[PDB]
């Protein structure tokens, strides 16, 4: 049976449907981190032109179909769609179709054969981000504490300047 080519063949296949894909910008590059699959993708902040993908008509259809189903299933009662879908070319050869959300409150892409490089990025970021947040609070608390002790040393010196001066002077 004969059928048209463009709507029958694709050069990209839908891999994963992420419900929560947080996008952040730091170091001059967007970082799409998914907490569900524990993966982090890096891009160049420039929307990869979908027209550049050879035989990629199935990608506007597949991406929009998943977005509509996911939005109505979970984000209809709490979030709102902002703009149209955005396609970004991530490091390693992964094309990410992104749909920003807000709270009510010609060539062929070569995909790498291992996503473990991205999983390590998420794991390191998931351990570095909090540990640094807790290293930052401890440092802040220590400084606030030291400034608090000065109120006691200013009075302890009068009681016995010999002992206070000895430990402070060295």
């Amino acid at each position: 049976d004969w059928v048209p080519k463009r709507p029958s063949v694709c050069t990209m296949t839908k891999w994963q449907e992420v419900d929560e894909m947080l996008r952040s910008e730091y170091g001059g590059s967007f970082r799409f981190s998914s907490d569900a699959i524990s993966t982090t993708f890096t891009t160049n902040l420039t929307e990869y032109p979908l027209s550049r993908v050879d035989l990629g008509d199935c990608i506007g259809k597949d991406a929009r179909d998943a977005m509509d189903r996911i939005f109505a299933r979970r984000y209809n009662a709490t979030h709102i769609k902002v703009g149209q879908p955005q396609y970004y070319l991530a490091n390693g050869g992964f094309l990410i179709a992104y749909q920003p959300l807000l709270s009510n409150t010609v060539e062929r892409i070569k995909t790498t054969s291992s996503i473990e490089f991205a999983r390590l990025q998420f794991t390191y970021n998931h351990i570095q981000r909090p540990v640094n947040d807790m290293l930052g609070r401890v440092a802040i608390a220590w400084c606030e504490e030291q400034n608090h002790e000065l109120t006691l040393w200013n009075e302890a010196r009068k009681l016995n300047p010999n002992a206070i001066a000895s430990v402070t002077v060295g």
């Epitope: 929307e47 929009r64 939005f71 209809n76 769609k81 902002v82 703009g83 149209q84 920003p100 807000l102």
Partner: antibody
Amino acid sequence: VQLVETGGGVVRPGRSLRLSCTTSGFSFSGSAMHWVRQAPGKGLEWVAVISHDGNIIQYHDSVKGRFTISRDNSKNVLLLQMNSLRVDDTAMYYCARDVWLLPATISYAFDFWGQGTMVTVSS
Amino acid sequence: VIWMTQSPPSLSASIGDTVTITCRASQGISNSIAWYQRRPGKAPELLVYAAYRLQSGVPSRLSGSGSGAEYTLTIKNMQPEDFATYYCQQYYDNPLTFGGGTKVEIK
């Protein structure tokens, strides 16, 4: 907020015309701009869009390849260079800013509209 | 191109009554749709976004609803300043298309 458009007038078919839209009251560099037309006694129709920084441009199938949208963030002025005009292009052109909901996304909706100017194609 | 069918093209209402304007698209657009208002002699002004988000400063008595390819805009208490042309525009896929428009007038 205030939006003003300049460059309208009567032009012969197949000729070029360039419109300009001045802005004030909002961060022009932080919001995308859109162009809308209103034919006499007809409905509204979108023309084109220019991102906040102008990196991406999108046009309507009825004006793709004929029009040319551009912006100058330094002078906070929007422009739409028109070429190869046709009789069907006779309409009131309005310049409108997108709805700011997120920092760099394009809402593809209109929140502020200008006074509009006429562009009549006659011979 | 996603055609936008808006009806009724024209209807009349009295001050202090309920009205409902229906807008239909040629294909399912989830919730990507906006509503506008254009008073005589003035430029249009946005009212609702994504079929449910009311714009800042818009009266709370005016609200929209619907899903898929069916959408509606309702006003529970008409005021003299509400009589104007209302347009429904979609942004699910390019090119952006507006509705036929419905002119609410005094009856």
